[PDB]
């Protein structure tokens with residue numbers, strides 16, 4: 013008597029992983045509980061990630077297109093920018109959503125327990141109750157609850173990677189800060205050339221900041237095909253002053269007149285630079301090491317992930333781990349899927365994460381979308397492939413929409429001739445790789461996709477046209493292999 | 495000696511059908527010729543249809559979205575509209591394209607013969623040479639060429655259906671006129687509630703006209719699922735004064751102060767109406783009866799189509815017919831496909847138009863996209879189906895893009911559980927039905943599509959989510975069948 017509660021399944025984390033696992037299990041007739049330390053469910057993705065970043069990226073995109081339409085004799089002056097209202101519009105999509113999740117848990121009879129959860133023993137969670145209402149600003153009530161579970165689905169995600177040498181200062185922000193829209197910096201450093209920051213960068217440049225980007229690697233959007241990035245970098249090169257790649261951020265020293273940062277590398281200003289703000293978008297760390305997993309017997313990598321098996325099971329058989337905590341690619345769509353397989357095992361169904369392909373998407377302008385085998389992956393595995401690329405320059409619709417600089421690329425298994433990869437640079441790229449994604453899942457071949465009558469004039473049909481080019485049958489492009 | 499020429503294949507018409515058939519055959523090593531009465535290839539679709547309509551529809555869409563972004567605190571005044579430049583922008587996508595086709599024929603060594611072609615006998619085309627440079631304004635030179643062919647691919651398309659009682663007047667336009675952009679009428683009647691006019695209508699309303707639409711049928715976009723139209727009609731109802739459906743246009747009498755038209759029906763103004771212009775978008779007639787097909791022995795329906803077999807062959811074995819002339823749905827993507835099968839038969843390969851599904855798309859705002867089985871088709875065949883609908887109201891991305899009023903609908907064979915239909919109301923609908931289209935072609939099932947990891951947050955993933963809803967597994971919506 014005090015604070016103890018018993019459940020079938022207890023999902024630690026109410027992120028995309030967790031509330032999907034939770035509602036699934038729930039859906040199975042299981043008595044489940046979500047232990048979330050903030051009061052809103054949806055995790056990072058709904059609250060300080062996927063959704064506000066993309067709502068923002070969509071406003072920015074429309075203001076860049078009005079810049080273009082002038083030339084079609086459609087004329088507008090610069091727009092009046094209200095960030096109080098911009099800000100609140102984002103907060104609005106988000107709360108609308110968070111409000112619904114909540115409602116959905118109620119309806120599913122799932123219990124949300126607001127509190128940081130820590131493992132007591134293999135069948136007990138110690139929950140240090142928490143109070144607050146704003147995602148990321150929750151405080152421990154001092155009160156504590158003991159929750160017991162048949163099963164436990166660990167879904168505690170990851171968190172912004174902090175660089176050791178970067179000092180604290182209201183002007184050095186991570187993406188939750190950037191998503192704050194406290195103000196458009198006149199000049200913004202972006203540490204890390206990955207999707208998140210380039211996505212952050214794009215909204216700020218279009219709202220007015222001039223950006224600099226530092227990437228320790230050889231390029232931007234590491235992990236996508238450079239041919240695709242090439243197209244993206246060509247079209248946004250004008251948003252940056254300096255695209256400092258293969259460069260080290262060495263000094264970061266805040267001054268009364270802005271944050272002064274020194275870089276080490278090549279094509280790197282030897283003169284320390286000044287910015288009115290610096291966005292640290294250096295990566296994300298999984299939180300396995302912060303839940304006292306060792307008390308449940310759960311094994312955690314030194315890097316912080318919980319390796320798990322195709323069933324989402326950890327070394328502890330009644331304990332499953334899903335989402336970013338489990339491994340790369342850290343993406344909400346990945347997490348919802350692992351989320352359903354672990355909930356099903358919990359309900360005693362035997363489920364394997366069996367999907368062979370997971371989509372990556374920079375929702376920049378243009379969007380860079382890819383799946384399955386990539387030329388580099390292939391080149392790494394020295395897998396032997398057949399890529400079929402269809403230029404949008406040939407597409408009536410892209411020409412009409414003024415995006416003929418992009419293209420659709422389909423890659424095939426040179427032995428089987430089966431599709432195993434897909435890349436799309438261009439508006440809606442992410443709305444279109446889902447067909448190269450079912451394609452790969454159905455083990456389709458170029459004749460499969462190509463004889464599919466895609467509608468015209470559209471961007472969508474370049475998947476088909478890329479297929480005919482594979483078949484050497486495209487009559488919208490110069491003849492192939494005469 | 496005078497004007498005679500011999501070819502393997504002679505394609506009558508340089509439309510989407512024809513130049514695809516022509517470049518294909520050509521591609522087979524065949525000696526081919528395109529007989530086109532205008533000087534630009536691409537036919538109606540490139541020149542007075544698909545492409546200019548969609549280039550126009552894309553400018554209009556961006557000006558309606560800026561109307562919306564205010565509310566996100568992004569503020570613009572009305573735009574300055576330059577129709578001389580608008581006009582020329584459209585003409586620009588188009589000529590860019592027409593210029594390339596041309597270049598492509600040259601490169602493929604195909605001969606374009608500019609002249610109206612008429613059948614002499616089963617192996618002879620009488621070409622009455624023609625002169626002009628503007629699509630639809632070509633004039634007969636009086637000179638004539640006799641072209642002989644192994645094979646002939648008739649691809650002569652269709653033409654705007656003229657209503658008998660409508661008098662002539664610069665103010666009564668068909669879609670080539672509307673595409674002229676001579677001026678935004680203050681008031682525009684639209685005869686016919688089909689896709690073409692509603693597409694025309696949308697650009698004009700957004701450029702400023704107030705529209706009225708008359709449809710003899712029970713509704714708009716006849717042929718799509720009413721649930722989809724419902725969503726479209728709800729969101730554009732404010733563009734019309736009168737959506738006169740189930741109504742007859744009886745009088746159409748031009749006056750000094752605009753075209754006065756009387757309608758017969760219900761909710762039909764008993765007072766004859768005045769418009770500064772009337773767009774007759776009543777349908778399109780195929781041209782089989784206008785090529786002296788009877789001289790090749792080719793049989794033509796009284797309606798004007800050339801019925802043909804899965805090989806594109808007409809009753810005359812060495813004579814094939816493709817595109818709108820052959821039958822509904824008259825769509826450029828249909829024509830390119832029939833186009834390749836007839837070219838292949840010509841090269842002695844045995845080819846069947848074997849695709850089971852062809853996409854229809856109103857590129858309005860929102861776009862209404864569908865394929866395969868529709869509820870009405872099903873309800874007609876009394877086929878037994880399983881529809882899975884996913885509301886965009888639940889979609890983070892649609893909410894963020896402000897299109898949560900639309901949805902994705904997947905329909906399944908209730909016996910086999912196979913997908914056989916797909917409908918998408920919403921922006922990019924046409925860029926997304928191609929996956930419900932490969933789906934149907936691969937004979938996928940809800941578990942097939944559903945276990946496909948579509949990327950988030952996107953519009954694209956509602957295909958997947960509609961699938962889980964089929965599976966009763968969607969954890970982004972209230973539980974299904976508790």
Ligand SMILES: Cc1cc2nc3c(=O)[nH]c(=O)nc-3n(C[C@@H](O)[C@@H](O)[C@@H](O)COP(=O)(O)OP(=O)(O)OC[C@H]3O[C@@H](n4cnc5c(N)ncnc54)[C@H](O)[C@@H]3O)c2cc1C
Pocket residue numbers: 024025026027028029030047048049050054055056057058060061062063065066127128129130167168169170187208299302303334335336337342343344345346347375950951
């Ligand atoms: C700016 C940004 C934008 C992004 N955009 C996208 C995108 O467009 N598409 C995409 O696929 N992904 C993108 N990501 C990825 C990210 O959203 C997803 O990978 C992530 O949400 C996956 O869900 P997750 O389940 O594993 O965990 P999470 O998002 O990380 O949620 C974990 C939750 O559980 C709670 N929690 C953690 N530890 C405890 C504890 N001990 N006790 C109690 N509760 C705890 C936390 O409060 C948190 O709410 C974005 C990320 C960022 C940072």
Ligand SMILES: Cc1cc2nc3c(=O)[nH]c(=O)nc-3n(C[C@@H](O)[C@@H](O)[C@@H](O)COP(=O)(O)OP(=O)(O)OC[C@H]3O[C@@H](n4cnc5c(N)ncnc54)[C@H](O)[C@@H]3O)c2cc1C
Pocket residue numbers: 468469506507508509510511512529530531532536537538539540542543544545547548609610611612649650651652669690781784785816817818819824825826827828829857
């Ligand atoms: C405004 C409008 C918009 C449209 N938008 C789209 C769309 O977005 N998507 C879509 O799929 N379809 C839409 N359509 C459909 C239409 O573009 C296609 O169905 C049509 O182009 C299909 O190609 P077709 O080959 O059969 O013939 P066509 O377009 O009709 O071409 C026939 C050609 O051959 C020439 N010809 C005809 N008779 C003779 C003769 N006797 N001698 C010599 N040459 C001759 C004509 O000059 C013409 O160029 C649109 C139509 C219109 C009117």
